[PDB]
RNA sequence: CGCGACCUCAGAUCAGACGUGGCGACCCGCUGAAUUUAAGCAUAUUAGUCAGCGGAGGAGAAGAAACUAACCAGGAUUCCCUCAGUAACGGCGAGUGAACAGGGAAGAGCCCAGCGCCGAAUCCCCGCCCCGCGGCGGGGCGCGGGACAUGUGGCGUACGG
RNA sequence: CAUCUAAGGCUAAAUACCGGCACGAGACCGAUAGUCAACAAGUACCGUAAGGGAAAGUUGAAAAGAACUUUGAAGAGAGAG
RNA sequence: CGCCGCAGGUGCAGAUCUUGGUGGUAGUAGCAAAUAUUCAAACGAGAACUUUGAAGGCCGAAGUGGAGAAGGGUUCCAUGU
RNA sequence: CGACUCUUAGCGGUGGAUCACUCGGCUCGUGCGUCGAUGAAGAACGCAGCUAGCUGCGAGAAUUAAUGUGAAUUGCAGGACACAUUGAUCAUCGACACUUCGAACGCACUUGCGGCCCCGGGUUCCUCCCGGGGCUACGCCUGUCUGAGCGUCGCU
């Protein structure tokens, strides 16, 4: 789960994550929040596992 | 309402003549500032003279002022032909001319 | 008295130039005399008050001989704070108690080449005057 | 009744927000902003309301572009130039 | 802003009130009693020398 | 002439101002021919305008234009007025020969309503009341 | 161990770019920090490394916008950015040359009749 | 309503962000003189503009 | 019966430029009331004013007589004092109402078209080189384009040429 | 008889300035006054809208803004400072 | 602040006066449209009104039920006060 | 005796008059007298470690650079900062940058949809998809190119 910029795509969303992580997605639900934010709902391919992504991201 | 004796006055106000009231509190300052505007252009034309051009002798018109002389706009055609200086030249050297005024006498 | 029309005498406007001052000219507004050996040793009479230059109170409750550091200049209040000049507050701790840098004299100068550029440039005014008025 | 029970029925908007000067005169239905006639070119202004006018003049917002136009002209509007290298 | 603040005051009317004005500046009765101390001053149309 | 432009002629008010026919318009066909030529000719100046035809409906007027920012005319001194900002929108302000006709201007007894530049200058002039300091 | 402006203008574009990536993927962990908690002093490292990419953007476009200026310089027609911008009435007026030329009848005149120094007794 | 606009949205946004007590902090602050938010709208009392 | 010249038109996201909108106290061009006064009221007054529309600049407008005068003549425009609450207008009622001369502030004059003469003497644009950059100019070059005799430039404009 | 020469054009100064930038001053007002607005004021708020539109200044030299004890669930008190 | 002069936005009981504040009325009118509550327990300083259980009733599917449009704009959901 | 009521006084409430103060106005005067397609005025939305308003600012967002200045900012925290292998803060401001509407400009908006030319990626050149960049408003001037006319002609 990503807070994105509002004009970001999901063909966008999907390219920014795939580069600055090195990791490959299957698909990105996108919603704009009540307070004006963008969120990103970014499911990762079946061979990337999110929890070690997360952990080397660093959002534990 | 009249009252007793009076002069009949018929005063001019009634057009809204508040919104054109021309006060002169600025009289002071415009007077310094002509003069600072005179002093300044005397010392621009450093060793010409101050007033300006020399203006010609002029008889006022009427039959109430023909008695009394003043000075005019700028010297004649005629006067400046008789005087040997051309009408470009005098313009040049402080002399004021006036195209437009003959010499009747 | 005042001649340049260009400067006001209006209490309000300085008061209001006083109390809007940027930090940049707080720091003039917030000069000190220095001590008398020192007004002596340089040429000048007052000076900006400085972060770590140590002074003696004159004027007020914490009058006395004794020299303190100063420690905090603290231009928004236009007050500084000094090492001892303190009291206690009602659940024990210390508190500085800020004081106008004008009831202090300088007895010695946190001497860095910024200050010596202006000492000295302080003094040469002076003395220019001294010899224009001789 | 026209009253109360009228007082009822009033659910659909006549105005919304105008894209130009950002208040809610737009008239959907007219498609003209009621405080500044937003399609027209020019600014709806009338000289029999200098209250309204001096709500939105020149100065009650940003001035982005005039302040610093003012400042620049204190210098002659100079450009090509910077401060003398220390 | 249009009150008619100024007055305008005859020339001689004017020159009157100057003559007036120095003619008591000479009386030390009269500058007594401005309070103007001239206890010691040697003499009240008091001249001094171009030097000054 | 000028119909006065009111809803079925009415013109509420006092009988002197019920006049909506056989009203005439202050300015000439021509000053109006210039004006429309300005307007959507705006980038142009309007220099003058002479009559090349009447029918009993239209006249018909023929407006000379100059483009201030062409170098033939920005190059040229006794054109280079014309491209001063002071001269935009002659044909607007009456400053053309055929709008000026209008205004009352000129010399001697006949034009005193215009003494100060126009009417509205002599009117001013003349329904001021100066109030000296010293009155 | 911040970064200045002075030391940023000797460098090359690859560098340049090189620092300006460095300081984006530590912002973007400065903001991750701030979201979990993280501590003040990652909290308060967040300005200064947006100070810092702010201060390199700002070289990478000063020194482009210096290199297009000298490219430009001596053509006729430039980038309308790169023309300048007193004010839009002072950008339509005449130049030097065309306001303080003459014709040929206006020089005549003074070249014959020019104006002279003159004083009068009394 | 459900159905929304995004300037309709966006404009709920910022009047949600804005509609918050002021930090404590604030008081601190030297020459403050501000006790609390008096911009404070509740979407029952009064309504919003739009 | 096709190819050319010209004329009058058209298109282009053509090359390069310009206008739009804001402010609007002051200024210019229009449009333009009624309240009010007249102890009623319609002409009149309010007022060429409020409101309305357009257009500018640091000022604007005006401006170098198809003037004023009737004198022993003055001499562009603008502003001040006065003329003058006057001449005059007006249900000659209420009310309205300048100008010339005089004294000052300032002071500055000029240019075309036309009539003619001069081998279009004229102007714009595009390439090349040099001096420069500081709002983009100057010089030289082009059997380089265009405008222009349906008239560019120099001389010359009532003060005569 | 006098006077000018229309139906083309330009032109600085003296003049105007309740908007703007930056200043100076005052026999003015002094928080129901003076701008509506001395303050997060064309703000809060009202009206569909055009538009309407407030109230609201002052601890102390310095927060030194009442530690601590005690009753009460607390507000709030009694001591103390 | 007195005295000599100077100058006013210079004296209040009224104007169904303007703004602000405060009384009597008065612990009064009133908190009465749509049948209805009761027992025990829990938490809690505190329970007619909260929660749980038990009982008695009501809406009675054209609902006091379950979901939408318009409109509202976070009122939604947890925890705490 | 008490209650109650009335008058007066002390004290205490309620209330905010009075007085003192004034970073505000009002008035007069002075010098300048400067907006915009190179995108104005105005509007919207965002931008702070903790930040709602105000203020400032524009994705480089409570600011970058430069210059002057010379040790702070400050409510708290944090970390700088030899002040010389250059510097806190503030001021100035000439470099750079400056989101979306808005004259507002591809068309349209209480929504959304195109077209053309380049670049990168999936392609593994051929043109489909994604991303990036630059263009695509009206009027009008000079010139250019392409044209139209049973307009006037010339030659065949
Ligand atoms: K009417
Ligand atoms: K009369
Ligand atoms: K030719
Ligand atoms: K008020
Ligand atoms: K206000
Ligand atoms: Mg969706
Ligand atoms: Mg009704
Ligand atoms: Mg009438
Ligand atoms: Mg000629
Ligand atoms: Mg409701
Ligand atoms: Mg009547
Ligand atoms: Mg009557
Ligand atoms: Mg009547
Ligand atoms: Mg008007
Ligand atoms: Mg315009
Ligand atoms: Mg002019
Ligand atoms: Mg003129
Ligand atoms: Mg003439
Ligand atoms: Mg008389
Ligand atoms: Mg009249
Ligand atoms: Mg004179
Ligand atoms: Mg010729
Ligand atoms: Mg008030
Ligand atoms: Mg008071
Ligand atoms: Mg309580
Ligand atoms: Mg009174
Ligand atoms: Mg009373
Ligand atoms: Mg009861
Ligand atoms: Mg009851
Ligand atoms: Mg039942
Ligand atoms: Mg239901
Ligand atoms: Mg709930
Ligand atoms: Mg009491
Ligand atoms: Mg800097
Ligand atoms: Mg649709
Ligand atoms: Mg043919
Ligand atoms: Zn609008």
Same mark, same amino acid.
């Given at each position: 789960?990503?807070?994105?910029?509002?004009?970001?795509?999901?063909?966008?969303?999907?390219?920014?994550?795939?580069?600055?992580?090195?990791?490959?997605?299957?698909?990105?639900?996108?919603?704009?929040?009540?307070?004006?934010?963008?969120?990103?709902?970014?499911?990762?391919?079946?061979?990337?596992?999110?929890?070690?992504?997360?952990?080397?991201?660093?959002?534990? | 309402?009249?009252?007793?004796?009076?002069?009949?006055?018929?005063?001019?106000?009634?057009?809204?003549?508040?919104?054109?009231?021309?006060?002169?509190?600025?009289?002071?300052?415009?007077?310094?500032?002509?003069?600072?505007?005179?002093?300044?252009?005397?010392?621009?034309?450093?060793?010409?003279?101050?007033?300006?051009?020399?203006?010609?002798?002029?008889?006022?018109?009427?039959?109430?002022?023909?008695?009394?002389?003043?000075?005019?706009?700028?010297?004649?055609?005629?006067?400046?032909?008789?005087?040997?200086?051309?009408?470009?030249?005098?313009?040049?050297?402080?002399?004021?001319?006036?195209?437009?005024?003959?010499?009747?006498? | 008295?005042?001649?340049?029309?260009?400067?006001?005498?209006?209490?309000?406007?300085?008061?209001?130039?006083?109390?809007?001052?940027?930090?940049?000219?707080?720091?003039?507004?917030?000069?000190?005399?220095?001590? =008398?050996?020192?007004?002596?040793?340089?040429?000048?009479?007052?000076?900006?008050?400085?972060?770590?230059?140590?002074?003696?109170?004159?004027?007020?409750?914490?009058?006395?001989?004794?020299?303190?550091?100063?420690?905090?200049?603290?231009?928004?209040?236009?007050?500084?704070?000094?090492?001892?000049?303190?009291?206690?507050?009602?659940?024990?701790?210390?508190?500085?108690?800020?004081?106008?840098?004008?009831?202090?004299?300088?007895?010695?100068?946190?001497?860095?080449?910024?200050?010596?550029?202006?000492?000295?440039?302080?003094?040469?005014?002076?003395?220019?005057? =001294?010899?224009?008025?001789? | 009744?026209?009253?109360?029970?009228?007082?009822?029925?009033?659910?659909?908007?006549?105005?919304?927000?105008?894209?130009?000067?950002?208040?809610?005169?737009?008239?959907?239905?007219?498609?003209?902003?009621?405080?500044?006639?937003?399609?027209?070119?020019?600014?709806?202004?009338?000289?029999?309301?200098?209250?309204?006018?001096?709500?939105?003049?020149?100065?009650?917002?940003?001035?982005?572009?005039?302040?610093?136009?003012?400042?620049?002209?204190?210098?002659?509007?100079?450009?090509?130039?910077?401060?003398?290298?220390? | 802003?249009?009150?008619?603040?100024?007055?305008?005051?005859?020339?001689?009317?004017?020159?009157?009130?100057?003559?007036?004005?120095?003619?008591?500046?000479?009386?030390?009765?009269?500058?007594?009693?401005?309070?103007?101390?001239?206890?010691?001053?040697?003499?009240?149309?008091?001249?001094?020398?171009?030097?000054? | 002439?000028?119909?006065?432009?009111?809803?079925?002629?009415?013109?509420?008010?006092?009988?002197?101002?019920?006049?909506?026919?056989?009203?005439?318009?202050?300015?000439?066909?021509?000053?109006?021919?210039?004006?429309?030529?300005?307007?959507?000719?705006?980038?142009?100046?309007?220099?003058?305008?002479?009559?090349?035809?009447?029918?009993?409906?239209?006249?018909?007027?023929?407006?000379?234009?100059?483009?201030?920012?062409?170098?033939?005319?920005?190059?040229?001194?006794?054109?280079?007025?014309?491209?001063?900002?002071?001269?935009?929108?002659?044909?607007?302000?009456?400053?053309?020969?055929?709008?000026?006709?209008?205004?009352?201007?000129?010399?001697?007894?006949?034009?005193?309503?215009?003494?100060?530049?126009?009417?509205?200058?002599?009117?001013?002039?003349?329904?001021?009341?100066?109030?000296?300091?010293?009155? | 161990?911040?970064?200045?402006?002075?030391?940023?203008?000797?460098?090359?574009?690859?560098?340049?770019?090189?620092?300006?990536?460095?300081?984006?993927?530590?912002?973007?962990?400065?903001?991750?920090?701030?979201?979990?908690?993280?501590?003040?002093?990652?909290?308060?490292?967040?300005?200064?490394?947006?100070?810092?990419?702010?201060?390199?953007?700002?070289?990478?476009?000063?020194?482009?916008?210096?290199?297009?200026?000298?490219?430009?310089?001596?053509?006729?027609?430039?980038?309308?950015?790169?023309?300048?911008?007193?004010?839009?009435?002072?950008?339509?007026?005449?130049?030097?040359?065309?306001?303080?030329?003459?014709?040929?009848?206006?020089?005549?005149?003074?070249?014959?009749?020019?104006?002279?120094?003159?004083?009068?007794?009394? | 309503?459900?159905?929304?606009?995004?300037?309709?949205?966006?404009?709920?946004?910022?009047?949600?962000?804005?509609?918050?007590?002021?930090?404590?902090?604030?008081?601190?602050?030297?020459?403050?003189?501000?006790?609390?938010?008096?911009?404070?709208?509740?979407?029952?009392?009064?309504?919003?503009?739009?």
């Amino acid at each position: 789960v990503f807070i994105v910029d509002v004009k970001a795509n999901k063909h966008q969303i999907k390219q920014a994550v795939k580069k600055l992580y090195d990791i490959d997605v299957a698909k990105v639900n996108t919603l704009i929040r009540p307070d004006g934010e963008k969120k990103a709902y970014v499911r990762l391919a079946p061979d990337y596992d999110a929890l070690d992504v997360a952990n080397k991201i660093g959002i534990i | 309402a009249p009252s007793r004796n009076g002069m009949v006055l018929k005063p001019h106000f009634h057009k809204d003549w508040q919104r054109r009231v021309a006060t002169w509190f600025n009289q002071p300052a415009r007077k310094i500032r002509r003069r600072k505007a005179r002093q300044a252009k005397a010392r621009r034309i450093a060793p010409r003279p101050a007033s300006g051009p020399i203006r010609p002798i002029v008889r006022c018109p009427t039959v109430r002022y023909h008695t009394k002389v003043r000075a005019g706009r700028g010297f004649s055609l005629e006067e400046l032909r008789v005087a040997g200086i051309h009408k470009k030249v005098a313009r040049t050297i402080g002399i004021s001319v006036d195209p437009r005024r003959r010499n009747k006498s | 008295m005042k001649f340049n029309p260009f400067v006001t005498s209006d209490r309000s406007k300085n008061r209001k130039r006083h109390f809007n001052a940027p930090s940049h000219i707080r720091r003039k507004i917030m000069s000190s005399p220095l001590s =008398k050996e020192l007004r002596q040793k340089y040429n000048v009479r007052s000076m900006p008050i400085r972060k770590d230059d140590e002074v003696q109170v004159v004027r007020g409750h914490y009058k006395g001989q004794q020299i303190g550091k100063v420690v905090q200049v603290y231009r928004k209040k236009y007050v500084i704070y000094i090492e001892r000049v303190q009291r206690e507050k009602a659940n024990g701790t210390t508190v500085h108690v800020g004081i106008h840098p004008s009831k202090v004299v300088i007895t010695r100068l946190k001497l860095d080449k910024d200050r010596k550029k202006i000492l000295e440039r302080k003094a040469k005014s002076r003395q220019v005057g =001294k010899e224009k008025g001789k | 009744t026209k009253g109360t029970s009228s007082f009822g029925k009033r659910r659909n908007k006549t105005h919304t927000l105008c894209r130009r000067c950002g208040s809610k005169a737009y008239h959907l239905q007219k498609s003209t902003c009621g405080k500044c006639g937003y399609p027209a070119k020019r600014k709806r202004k009338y000289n029999w309301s200098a209250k309204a006018k001096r709500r939105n003049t020149t100065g009650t917002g940003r001035m982005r572009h005039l302040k610093i136009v003012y400042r620049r002209f204190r210098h002659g509007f100079r450009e090509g130039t910077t401060p003398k290298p220390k | 802003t249009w009150r008619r603040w100024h007055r305008r005051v005859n020339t001689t009317q004017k020159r009157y009130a100057i003559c007036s004005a120095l003619a008591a500046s000479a009386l030390p009765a009269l500058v007594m009693s401005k309070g103007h101390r001239i206890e010691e001053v040697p003499e009240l149309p008091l001249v001094v020398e171009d030097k000054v | 002439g000028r119909k006065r432009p009111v809803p079925k002629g009415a013109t509420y008010g006092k009988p002197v101002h019920h006049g909506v026919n056989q009203l005439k318009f202050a300015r000439s066909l021509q000053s109006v021919a210039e004006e429309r030529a300005g307007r959507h000719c705006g980038a142009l100046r309007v220099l003058n305008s002479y009559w090349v035809g009447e029918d009993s409906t239209y006249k018909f007027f023929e407006v000379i234009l100059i483009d201030p920012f062409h170098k033939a005319i920005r190059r040229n001194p006794d054109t280079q007025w014309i491209t001063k900002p002071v001269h935009k929108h002659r044909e607007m302000r009456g400053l053309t020969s055929a709008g000026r006709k209008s205004r009352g201007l000129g010399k001697g007894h006949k034009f005193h309503h215009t003494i100060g530049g126009s009417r509205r200058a002599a009117w001013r002039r003349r329904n001021t009341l100066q109030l000296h300091r010293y009155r | 161990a911040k970064i200045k402006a002075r030391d940023l203008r000797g460098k090359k574009k690859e560098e340049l770019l090189k620092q300006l990536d460095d300081l984006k993927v530590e912002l973007s962990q400065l903001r991750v920090a701030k979201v979990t908690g993280g501590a003040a002093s990652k909290l308060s490292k967040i300005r200064v490394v947006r100070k810092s990419i702010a201060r390199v953007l700002t070289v990478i476009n000063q020194t482009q916008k210096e290199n297009l200026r000298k490219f430009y310089k001596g053509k006729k027609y430039k980038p309308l950015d790169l023309r300048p911008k007193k004010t839009r009435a002072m950008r339509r007026r005449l130049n030097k040359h065309e306001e303080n030329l003459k014709t040929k009848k206006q020089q005549r005149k003074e070249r014959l009749y020019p104006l002279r120094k003159y004083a009068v007794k009394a | 309503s459900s159905h929304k606009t995004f300037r309709i949205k966006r404009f709920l946004a910022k009047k949600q962000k804005q509609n918050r007590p002021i930090p404590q902090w604030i008081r601190m602050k030297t020459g403050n003189k501000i006790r609390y938010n008096s911009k404070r709208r509740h979407w029952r009392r009064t309504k919003l503009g739009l």
